Structures are given as C-alpha cells and as structure tokens.
Amino acid sequence: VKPNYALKFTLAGHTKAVSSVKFSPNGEWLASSSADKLIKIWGAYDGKFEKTISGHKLGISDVAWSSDSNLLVSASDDKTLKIWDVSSGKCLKTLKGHSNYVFCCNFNPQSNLIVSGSFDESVRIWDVKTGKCLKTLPAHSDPVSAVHFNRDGSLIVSSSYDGLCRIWDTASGQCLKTLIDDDNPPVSFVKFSPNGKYILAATLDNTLKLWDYSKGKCLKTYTGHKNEKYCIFANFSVTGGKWIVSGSEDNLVYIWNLQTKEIVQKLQGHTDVVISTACHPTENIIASAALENDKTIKLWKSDC
Ligand SMILES: CCC[C@H](NC(=O)c1cccc(Cn2ccnc2)c1)C(=O)N1CCc2sccc2C1
C-alpha cells in the first residue's frame, strides 16, 4: 500500500525563506516561522491565511505549539525565544539566556516546559509560567540542530553539527546516552517516535536512520533524498500508512515506508529546498515549506 498525496493548497505571504511549519495539536491551524521575522497562522484544512504574529528583532528559525493549541514558542536569531498567546497575538514571555542564535524549540507534552537549542552549543530548559531558565545543559561542541521531548516529557533528545545525538533526563539534566555510529557526520535533525521507543536522526550524508536508543542499535536506514547542507525536519506519518516524511535539497517531499524503507512517493511542486514538513494530527495531510527562492507552504492530502 502506497499513499496518494496530491497538492490541495499553496500558501504565500512570507517575504523571506520559511524556516518551520507545525500543525496545532487540535488540527485547526498551521503555524509558520520565517527569516522575515514573522509567524503566520493558516487554516489547516482550507489553507486560509489567519493572522501574523510579530515582535522578534531578527529571523525566526523554529516554532512549536502548546498541547492546548493556545500558545506558540518561537526561536530567533535575536538570541531569544518568545511565548505567544495565539488568540490575542500577545508576547507573554521573552526567554533570555542564549549567547547566540536560538535554532530549535519544543514544548513538553505537559506544556509546562520549553526546551531550546542554540548556536551557543547549549540546550536550555525553561519554565513556561515564569519564563525563567531552569537548566543550561553543556550539550554539544557545535551548533545544536534539534531538541525534542519524548511522549511523557521524561527525556530530551538533542542533535548537533558535532555528529552526536544525546538523550537527557529532563528532571536531573544528566546526559543518559550518546549515540555514535560507525562514523559521525553532522546530525541535522532528531526526534522521538510517537511511542518514545525510537529516534529518527538525519545526517548530512543524505541519510535518515531509525535508532533503538534503549539498545543503541540502528533499525532502519532511508536514502534517495538530497541532504548535505540544511537542517531539514522529518516526521513519522501515523494517521494512515506508517511513513517517514522528509524535505530534500532537490526541492521534493520524500515519503518512505517505515518498515520496508522503500520510497512510496516524491511530491513535486516546490522550486527551492524543502526545509520543513509536518504531518496533521488526525487527517492524512502534509504541510511542506521551502527556502528563499520559493517562500511558499504547500498542503498535500492523501486518501491513505
Ligand atoms: C546551510 C546554512 C546553515 C544551516 N541552515 C539551516 O540548516 C537552516 C536554515 C533555515 C531553516 C532551517 C530549518 N530548521 C531546522 C531546525 N531549525 C530550523 C535550517 C545551519 O544552520 N547549519 C548547517 C547544517 C547543520 S547540521 C547541524 C547544525 C547545522 C547548522
């Protein structure tokens, strides 16, 4: 069984590269961040432009939703994160502490903590309510490409240009595991599987790997895409068939069968690097976004 993703909507509005797209947990909205210093909100089903949220002094690299779909956090080249009330557009908190660009951010499932990674080679854990930094982790020896909480918030995975994936105890700040393969190319993206048992890791050798972090063993390898330069988001698609979804420097969205590792679809339409993909929480919908020669977001829908 293969999916049949077809283009439904193209979303234009950002005036510089799009950096990240994310669906709201409630499935109603897509958030986009851009080098143009803006967050835009769009209807997840109709692609209808909703609103712009502004206030960052420099480009935004990443955005993430709270579990109640009410807050966004953004990571900016201005060295801050901002917590936003989506309905009002209010900046609730400015999270200050990183000494260089803030590159990646996420809420924990409980949505009482934010994790951030920075070009300062640190990971920070923040209190959502106070905006206070709780822990600085000396995580890496080069820029941090990704940070992600597991399904119960007990672990953080981080990745770096240093070629390491690291698993952290949220409560203690202790480094529990460092994942090392037969070589250590730059790790451009990492995230936990929905069940928290696996980690999907992208490396700048045109390769995605599914790791059993408990066993510290590689289970699956996915190739055929182009990834030598950029930190491209990848996803587990779970609403229909069990897929891996990623962007590509050849301007395509790649979809693999998770178990068999075969490419099942390549989605054509973007005119620059596909830097970001996101999977809708309930419908077979993918959002993709491209860099500065394109600047569009596309919504794709499958029957399976
Ligand atoms: C090639 C120029 C520099 C490179 N720009 C990006 O990867 C980039 C640019 C825009 C948007 C996004 C999307 N993204 C993903 C997560 N947070 C935002 C990423 C960059 O920052 N590296 C080079 C490659 C690697 S591998 C590990 C760190 C880095 C840093």
* Sign of the Cα pseudo-torsion (57, 51, 247, 75, in order): positive
Paired tokens of 41 = 């909100």
Distance of CA 114 to the CA centre of its chain: 14
23 C-beta closer than 6 A to ligand 1: no
Backbone angles phi, psi at 282, to 5 degrees: -130, -35
Distance CA 97, CA 125 (A): 11
- Method underlying the structure: X-ray
Please name the residue whose Cα sits nearest to atom 23 of ligand 1.
230
Domain map of the chain by residue range?
A: 1-304
CA 275 to ligand 1: nearest atom: 13
Ligand 1 contact via 145 beta carbon (within 6 Å): yes
Give the C-alpha separation, 115 to 238, whole Å.
24
Dist. CA 267–CA 145, nearest whole Å: 25
Atom of ligand 1 nearest to the CA of 188: 26
If you measure from the C-alpha of residue 271 to the centroid of ligand 1, how many angstroms do you get, rounded to a whole number?
Answer: 18
DSSP state of 28: S
Quote the CA–CA distance of 111 and 127 in Å, as a whole number: 9
For residue 1, the CA-to-ligand 1 centroid distance in Å is: 33
In angstroms, what is the resolution? 1.7
Q: 124 and 135 in contact (C-beta within 8 Å)?
A: yes
Q: How far is the CA of 184 from the centre of ligand 1 (A)?
A: 17
| DSSP letter string, 257-279 | ETTT--EEEEE---SS-EEEEEE
CA angle 266, 106, 99 (to 5 degrees): 110
Using alpha carbons, list the distances in angstroms from residue 270 to 13, 22, 224, 294, 299.
15, 18, 18, 7, 11
Mutation choice for ligand 1 from 63, 121, 140, 230, CB with most ligand atoms inside 8 A = 230
What gap in Å lies between CA 282 and CA 195, rounded to an integer? 16
The Cα 172–Cα 135 span in angstroms is 9
Q: What is the C-alpha separation between 45 and 148, in angstroms, rounded? A: 26
- Exposure of 175 by Cβ count < 10 A (0-12 exposed, 13-18 middle, 19+ buried)? middle
The two tokens of residue 253 are 């969205």
Closest C-alpha to 58, from 19, 12, 21: 19
**Best CA proximity match to 10, nearest among 251, 294, 245:** 294
Q: Whose CA is nearest to atom 27 of ligand 1?
A: 161
